[PDB]
């Protein structure tokens, strides 16, 4: 009965407080999602000045409730089943041969808006590595995100490896370990194993002078025909 | 050979001259595509006044060389192999229980830009139908586009059905019959049967008073692992 | 309606009368299929002596109603909707750089059994080619079979290319052009574009002295999530 | 350099010692695999008399080195990279609302034959549940098996949920937790996340009087196009 909150266009609000190797920063984001098409549009502004890490590294952190679950897979959509109350999304993101991000987020409805409020901590980054050295290109690849139930936590476990292209033609992996648990006590759907196929386009606003990211995503669940 | 021209961001120009049931109209489009990511961005303006048909019905008419062909399918990308000389793309589009569009286009490079120049004729539309009655929603679904070689023409045949959501909650089908033939006479890649998986985002430029459409697309080839 | 006849194990009979370059031959087959699992098992015997062509070249000729259509695609299964009256299945099979087979078959129920009765004519084969020179390996690859409705015939058009491994390490293509038309005149399901994914195991019955083939197949429809 | 041991047909030997709730049993199996097609054929004999659990429940226990990894995914085939030395395959299989199986197997080459030597322990089964009550049907569904690297163990972690149809029309889940670790010290490929699509056909030998299972499987890896 959470799926019905997502049949139309839903306003999104995103706020993040972060710290990577002692570099403090905040980001605010806003846009809208239309989960019927698995589509979302968001714009992010670093409100504390220059972002200390590359924008691409925060795409996964900045609302999987907006994925398109096709009609035959609707019994497997944990994300929307947890709403309006929401879910807590936690991750550890291991940058290959560099630091890690640990994030904790609350994804829930605040009135009619879907809010994603995040805290992020980055530790052990090389000062001249690809992340703090700003060596990633401003683009993004398409991935598969593997979901499985975690029946003991009443939530789900999620694993995927992001590929960030590097300015020299190599690739920086970011291994994502994730867990989602309901905030409410209402019943949730615990899905069968499946995956999400993702696509992301990064761009800029020609008239925006603050450091910023314009993001459009398409995400569609697949994997189950039983 | 031709695929070398698409390894970076390529400027695009679209030009269409149309006539639907005698209603004449012209649209110009511009933007860019990055085939490495199967992505493109374009803004279309109706330069003659209001569009007499819904914008969504012209998305497929308005550069399948911008699809992403994964490296294991590179031998199957007819579209870029015809470049720079280009190809002619012709369609009959049958709107179920209504009229049809017939289109002929030349897609080729003119300098450094990839231009799509089109002529379109629509006949037999119902004045009270979904098309001239403007009853299509401003949204777009994801499709599978089926491609097969047409050896005798040294080109390809392509077939697919677009699903246009109507404001009354029904879907209007648009059955596409398409053929592509190279403009040049040199060798082109003729593919084994496969498909392209498409996603399209339609939106509006908030600063624009003319009738127009902003489109972002993602398209990736699939269906071949040999 | 027709799909009700395939919820359990259905006996199958196959009968083919062939003529390739004047070499006449007949084959009979029998076994069973379980469409719930998209599976079938058949044993074929050449009742006239040795087969004048390789067994693998006749696998596609020798009951696509035994495919598994997942429940979200049940509206798209033309094959079972034509049952019990059946359909006529016709092909032209073009062996690249060699001859062609033309086939006409009636697939329908005769009592409780689903029988596939075929006539095949092969012309223009090279005496030293891979087919009459028996140079095909006794193995079979997995394919994607593309299906589209052919509204005017109230049937379907199907296209695919089979890859036959040759003993010298090369692959021999067999381009299939196929059309299916219902034998009865009542309504049938006409599908949206989709495909079937096929797998075939060929083997020998260790106790059998006649020329023969044991075949097990798995086939499942895909490509539609709407 | 382990992939080369699987280019042709490879003899398989399977031996299992088990005990489920104090019911001791042994099974021997033999056949052959052709990983180029992702294909295997095996026959099992309960050599201690009547099998105490349903044959379908042991299919997953009775050589993922026989999966077909298509050419573009060959850097992700952990199973063949570990050969000739092999890997240890461990699982816990939780039957929903019933007992669990814990298995440990050695999969390695013994001369030219690929051997799978297993020990299985079943605990906590209901004496009249679906397993010890012999309530499962003799058939099998197709599944996706999700693979991820376990870089700390130099092996892989595997999760999937088998669906066993029950004689009353319901389904018995069997949740599979699996881990594979190399037996040798040679280097192995640690794959990116991906999955295997499986298909299995169970049958009987008309002339065999011992309790037995005849099994044919097709398995193909998918999921990676980078």
Curated annotation (Swiss-Prot), chains A, B, C, D:
GO biological process, one term: bioluminescence
Consequence the record notes for mutating residue 162 to T: In P11; increases fluorescence at 475 nm excitation and at warmer temperatures such as 37 degrees Celsius. In Esmerald; leads to brighter fluorescence. In VisGreen; leads to brighter fluorescence
Effect of residue 62 to M: In RSGFP4; increases fluorescence and shifts the major exitation peak to 489-490 nm
Modifications the protein undergoes after translation, according to the UniProt entry: Contains a chromophore consisting of modified amino acid residues. Maturation of the chromophore requires nothing other than molecular oxygen.
Documented effect of changing residue 166 to L: In R10-3; matures to the red-emitting state with excitation and emission maxima at 555 and 585 nm, respectively
Impact after mutating residue 201 to V: In EBFP1.2; shifts the excitation and emission spectra to shorter wavelengths and increases quantum yields compared to BFP
Applied value in biotechnology: Green fluorescent protein has been engineered to produce a vast number of variously colored mutants, fusion proteins, and biosensors. Further generation of mutants led to more stable proteins (at 37 degrees Celsius for example) with brighter fluorescence and longer fluorescence lifetimes.
Effect of residue 148 to T: Increases fluorescence at warmer temperatures such as 37 degrees Celsius
Effect of residue 140 to H: In mut1.3; shifts fluorescence lifetime from 3.03 to 2.78 ns. In mut1.5; shifts fluorescence lifetime from 3.03 to 2.72 ns. In mut1.27; shifts fluorescence lifetime from 3.03 to 2.85 ns
Effect annotated for changing residue 37 to N: In EBFP1.2; shifts the excitation and emission spectra to shorter wavelengths and increases quantum yields compared to BFP
Effect of residue 44 to L: In mut3.3; shifts fluorescence lifetime from 3.03 to 1.88 ns. In R10-3; matures to the red-emitting state with excitation and emission maxima at 555 and 585 nm, respectively
Keyword terms, alphabetized: Chromophore, Luminescence, Photoprotein
Tissues expressing this chain: Photocytes.
Outcome of swapping residue 64 to M: In Citrinine; leads to excitation and emission peaks of 516 and 529 nm, respectively
Mutation effect (residue 74 to R): In Topaz; shifts the major emission and exitation peak up to 20 nm
Assembly and oligomerization: Monomer.
Assigned protein family: Belongs to the GFP family.
Name of the molecule in the record: Green fluorescent protein
Organism: Aequorea victoria (Water jellyfish)
Gene name in the database record: GFP
């Amino acid at each position: 009965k959470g799926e019905e909150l997502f049949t139309g266009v839903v306003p999104i609000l995103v706020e993040l407080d972060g710290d990577v190797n002692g570099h403090k920063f905040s980001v605010s984001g806003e846009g809208e999602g239309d989960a019927t098409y698995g589509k979302l549009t968001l714009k992010f502004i670093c409100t504390t000045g220059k972002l200390p890490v590359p924008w691409p590294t925060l795409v996964t952190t900045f609302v999987q409730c907006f994925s398109r679950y096709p009609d035959h897979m609707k019994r497997h959509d944990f994300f929307k089943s947890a709403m309006p109350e929401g879910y807590v999304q936690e991750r550890t993101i291991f940058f290959k041969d560099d630091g890690n991000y640990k994030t904790r987020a609350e994804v829930k409805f605040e009135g009619d808006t879907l809010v994603n409020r995040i805290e992020l901590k980055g530790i052990d980054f090389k000062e001249d590595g690809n992340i703090l050295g700003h060596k990633l290109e401003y683009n993004y690849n398409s991935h598969n995100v593997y979901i499985m139930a975690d029946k003991q936590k009443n939530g789900i476990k999620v694993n995927f490896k992001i590929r960030h292209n590097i300015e020299d033609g190599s690739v920086q992996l970011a291994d994502h370990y994730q867990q989602n648990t309901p905030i409410g006590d209402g019943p949730v759907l615990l899905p069968d194993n499946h995956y999400l196929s993702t696509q992301s386009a990064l761009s800029k606003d020609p008239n925006e002078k603050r450091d910023h990211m314009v993001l459009l995503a398409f995400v569609t669940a697949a994997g189950i025909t039983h």
